[PDB]
């Protein structure tokens, strides 16, 4: 619940500065709107693509840290480590 | 009223100068009395000072003086002398904006209208013609236009070049062919120098391309736009000549 709330807020903010800097970016506008023109399932799939390196993920570091901490806690609960 | 509008130096009339000049040119074309050349008035059969007679003209509100019916408008010879010293004395646009927007198009239309009644077309019963206009006046004024646009290629880029180009279209009809060597050769020579400069600059700029060429390619684009604007001010006259 909270993770998706924060992720949606960050995506809205990112789209905001992308729209603000559209005319400076010019050619970069298409590549920044590629994220927002993809179906929501693929949007979440590519937003959750930071499990291993792969800096091709718009997710910020704090949100990444939240997800990683929860994943580690869940693995501990499951008894993997 | 229209001549005072054209000659007036005011920020209010500044942005409407062009329309007033066009209206004055149209009126000069339409008006049947040679108002610029008042001295030979008596040979005009349509003149009010030739038809209405002294008693009726005094009954009406007329200055009774042919030279003073339109005192503010100078004589054609004086206008010719002024334009001749322009484009030759190094004209500054701060004091001379009105001239090439109002006064020259009026003279162009006046010449186009009054050439037919000039003595050169009908040398029979000469010196009784309504106007003293001549093909040599036409050549002199066209050379003056060529010289002023020559001086104004790179300075004061505006719509008045294409305006003067379309207004002076009728003048070219009765030009001597030697005006080519007289003025067109330096004019097109300088245009070709500008074209060579801009194409060389384009070739130099094509080598480099990065994030920030904008601060140079905008200037180069301005160069091409100015060159094309001068080219369209030029080639009608040359083509039709």
């Amino acid at each position: 619940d909270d993770f998706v709330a924060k992720l949606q807020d960050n995506q809205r903010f990112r789209y905001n500065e992308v729209m603000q800097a559209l005319n400076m970016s010019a050619a970069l506008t298409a590549r920044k709107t590629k994220e927002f023109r993809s179906p929501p399932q693929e949007q979440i799939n590519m937003l959750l693509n930071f499990k291993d390196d792969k800096s091709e993920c718009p997710c910020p570091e704090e949100i990444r840290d939240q997800l990683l901490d929860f994943h580690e806690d869940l693995m501990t609960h499951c008894g993997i480590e | 009223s229209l001549y005072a509008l054209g000659t007036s130096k005011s920020i209010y009339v500044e942005r409407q100068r062009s329309a007033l000049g066009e209206c004055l040119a149209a009126f000069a074309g339409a008006f049947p009395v040679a108002f610029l050349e008042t001295h030979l008035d008596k040979h005009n059969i349509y003149s009010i000072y030739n038809t209405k007679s002294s008693r009726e003209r005094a009954a009406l509100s007329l200055p009774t003086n042919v030279e003073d019916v339109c005192p503010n408008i100078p004589s054609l010879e004086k206008l010719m002398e002024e334009i001749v010293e322009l484009a030759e004395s190094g004209i500054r646009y701060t004091q001379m904006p009105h001239v090439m927007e109002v006064i020259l198009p009026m003279l162009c239309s006046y010449m186009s209208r009054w050439w037919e009644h000039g003595p050169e077309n009908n040398p029979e019963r000469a010196e009784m013609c309504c106007t003293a206009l001549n093909s040599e006046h036409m050549n002199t004024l066209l050379g003056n236009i060529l010289k002023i646009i020559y001086n104004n290629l790179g300075i004061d880029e505006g719509a008045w070049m294409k305006r003067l180009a379309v207004f002076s279209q009728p003048i070219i009809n009765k030009v001597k062919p030697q005006l080519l060597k007289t003025h067109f050769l330096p004019l097109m020579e300088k245009l070709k120098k500008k074209a060579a400069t801009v194409v060389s600059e384009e070739d130099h700029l094509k080598a480099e391309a990065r994030g920030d060429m904008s601060e140079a390619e905008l200037l180069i684009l301005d160069e091409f736009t100015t060159l094309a604007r001068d080219l369209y001010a030029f080639y009608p006259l040359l083509i039709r000549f």
């Binding site: - | 294409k162 379309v166 009809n173 080219l231 080639y235 009608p236 040359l238 083509i239 039709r240």
Partner: protein, 36 residues
Amino acid sequence: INNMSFLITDTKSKMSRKGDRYSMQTSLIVAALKRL
């Protein structure tokens, strides 16, 4: 600029939609070149 207006004014004394605004074929430069 009508572009062709200069030629129309020239041929006016002798009485001589899709492309109303502008046309490739009637460029002023190529017209001058073909006249010379």
